[PDB]
Write a protein that binds this ligand. Structure first.
Ligand code: ZN
Ligand code: ZN
Length: 265
């Protein structure tokens, strides 16, 4: 692996895990979103953090009263090292099935060495082989849960969001775990040498994500959905803290204006 990878202090900073809505729990760090969906047949994990975050995931699950080794399915929003850095460790420890967007499978399996921005300098994370390759609209089912993957390419070719219903004592909530279409500085939207369709994909994703319908949303980075303005440690259960259509439209509109200006460079 590449030595001396950048880690933001907020990526590794501990955060009190909590129940978001129903059987969906937050088990991530101050900045990095890691989501646990619990079922009678085992659990789904969406994302790790950086390498070493398997320890925090195991500890957070214990705090909530769940066993790490009951994770049966592994998912990611996109195959960058801040979201899959501990994915190989988690798969080795749990024997969970890795299910990945077909468009990110090669990137996940080569540890990021093919990354269209950060590649060619060796592995940024331990590689993971896919147990199931996912396509736009594919469903992931376990213990009564149905998760739909939507392809939201650009940030990586295989970047994707997940939509699913959770039930509590009161009502059903449709949750979106949204991969926000952020554009890195080094990206040329007319086409990148290892990703010629990058700008066409980002354009597609900005329109596609605006069209989604849901009750609650979260994202892989706290700042993208203002986690720490919506939630403080010890807050009473309150799913409505994550009802925020205005903030979702505002983040997508900001990225659409960046896209529009960067195309004109
Ligand atoms: Zn990323
Ligand atoms: Zn990230």
């Amino acid at each position: 692996l590449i030595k001396d990878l950048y880690v933001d202090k907020e990526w590794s900073a501990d955060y009190q895990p909590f129940r978001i809505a129903g059987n969906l729990y937050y088990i991530g760090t101050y900045d990095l979103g890691m989501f646990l969906i619990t079922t009678p047949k085992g659990h789904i994990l969406i994302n790790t953090g950086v390498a070493g975050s398997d320890t925090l995931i195991k500890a957070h699950m214990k705090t909530l009263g769940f066993k790490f080794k009951d994770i049966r399915i592994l998912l990611t929003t996109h195959a960058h090292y801040d979201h899959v850095g501990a994915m190989a460790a988690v798969k080795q420890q749990t024997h969970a099935k890795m299910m990945v967007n077909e468009k990110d499978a090669a990137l996940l399996a080569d540890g990021g060495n093919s990354d269209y921005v950060m590649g060619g300098k060796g592995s940024m994370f331990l590689p993971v082989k896919a147990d199931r390759l996912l396509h736009d609209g594919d469903s992931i089912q376990l213990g009564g849960m149905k998760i739909v993957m939507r392809q939201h390419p650009g940030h990586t070719p295989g970047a994707n969001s997940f939509l699913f219903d959770v039930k509590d004592a009161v009502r059903t909530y449709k949750v979106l775990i949204a991969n926000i279409p952020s554009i890195l500085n080094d990206t040329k939207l007319s086409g990148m040498p290892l990703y010629p369709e990058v700008g066409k994909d980002y354009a597609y994703t900005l329109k596609a994500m605006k069209a989604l319908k849901f009750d609650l949303w979260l994202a892989p980075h706290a700042g993208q959905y203002e986690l720490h303005k919506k939630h403080q440690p010890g807050d009473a259960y309150n799913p409505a803290a994550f009802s925020d259509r205005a903030g979702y439209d505002d983040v997508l509109d900001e990225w659409q204006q960046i896209y529009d200006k960067r195309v004109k460079e």
